Design a protein around this ligand. Structure first.
Ligand SMILES: CC[C@H](NC(=O)c1ccc2c(c1)c(C)c(C)n2Cc1ccc(-c2ccccc2C(=O)O)cc1)c1ccccc1
Lengths: 11, 259
């Protein structure tokens, strides 16, 4: 939520 | 777990995720290839020549270099994230925790692996095609003169352990699965994984470094030194925030936000 890019890298 | 199978799995994944290994870096740094020598960068003219010979951007050296480090850090975060996904159990963790582990783990990992690219006199750059001298980096105008020097200090001590890629693959996995990161929702399953990783690391070091029976203990104690570098780096970034009227890549801003 607060980490859009990291979240995308992770999924 | 089969601890030898785990160690092998992690090594194979590390090799797939990280294109410049310590093995390749050491070959280059000791001149044991497979040349020609990397282009040596020690001043502004050689930096400029290096850009020609060969491969918003500041025409100022200190910022140019700082920007290069940002770009490479953005790449490192992606490689590390790919690697994290290959650690057994990691992708089954709560997604908020996965993000937390990466957020707080990447600096420790980046600086651990940066040592692989360093000797006491400089650091390999641009996938090993260049070598940037430590004294040159030290000579950059304030506040950037102190940007790299703590990384080098750490690296000289850490490289004295003589770890190889198979050791490092497991150590980096141990770093990722750190149950003491601020904000973690389910600490237990992270520690269960780290416990298996520490076992694998211990066996790996015992078997492959027979002369230094307490290398495992020595390696775990490097965390203070590593975290100290990270603290000094964050502090310098604050000074840079005030002094430079500077832009930080969005992924890095994301990592630093509420760090
Ligand atoms: C995670 C915090 C982040 N990164 C670092 O502090 C950091 C510093 C150095 C790093 C690294 C990380 C990594 C991963 C490496 C390999 N290096 C070495 C390196 C050396 C030279 C260049 C370089 C300089 C000029 C022109 C081209 C290059 C080039 O090689 O492309 C790039 C990287 C940070 C946060 C905020 C600002 C800057 C850096």
């Amino acid at each position: 939520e607060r980490h859009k890019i990291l979240h995308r890298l992770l999924q | 777990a089969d601890l030898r199978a785990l160690a092998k799995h992690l090594y194979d994944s590390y090799i797939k995720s990280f294109p410049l290994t310590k093995a390749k870096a050491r070959a280059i740094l000791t001149g044991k290839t497979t040349d020609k020598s990397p282009f040596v960068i020690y001043d502004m003219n050689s930096l400029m020549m290096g850009e020609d010979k060969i491969k918003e951007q500041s025409k100022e050296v200190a910022i140019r270099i700082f920007q290069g480090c940002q770009f490479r850090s953005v790449e490192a975060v992606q490689e590390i994230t790919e690697y994290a996904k290959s650690i057994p159990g990691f992708v089954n963790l709560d997604l908020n925790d996965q993000v937390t582990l990466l957020k707080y783990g990447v600096h420790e990992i980046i600086y651990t692996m940066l040592a692989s690219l360093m000797n006491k006199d400089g650091v390999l750059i641009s996938e090993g095609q260049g070598f940037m001298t430590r004294e040159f980096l030290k000579s950059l105008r304030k506040p950037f003169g102190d940007f790299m020097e703590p990384k080098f200090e750490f690296a000289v001590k850490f490289n004295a352990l003589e770890l190889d890629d198979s050791d490092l693959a497991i150590f980096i996995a141990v770093i990722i699965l750190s149950g003491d990161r601020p904000g973690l929702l389910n600490v237990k399953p992270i520690e269960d994984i780290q416990d298996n990783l520490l076992q694998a690391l211990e066996l790996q070091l015992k078997l492959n470094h027979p002369e230094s029976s307490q290398l495992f203990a020595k390696l775990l104690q490097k965390m203070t030194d590593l975290r100290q570098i990270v603290t000094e780096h964050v502090q310098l970034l604050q000074v840079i925030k005030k002094t430079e009227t500077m832009s930080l890549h969005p992924l890095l801003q994301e990592i630093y936000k509420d760090l």
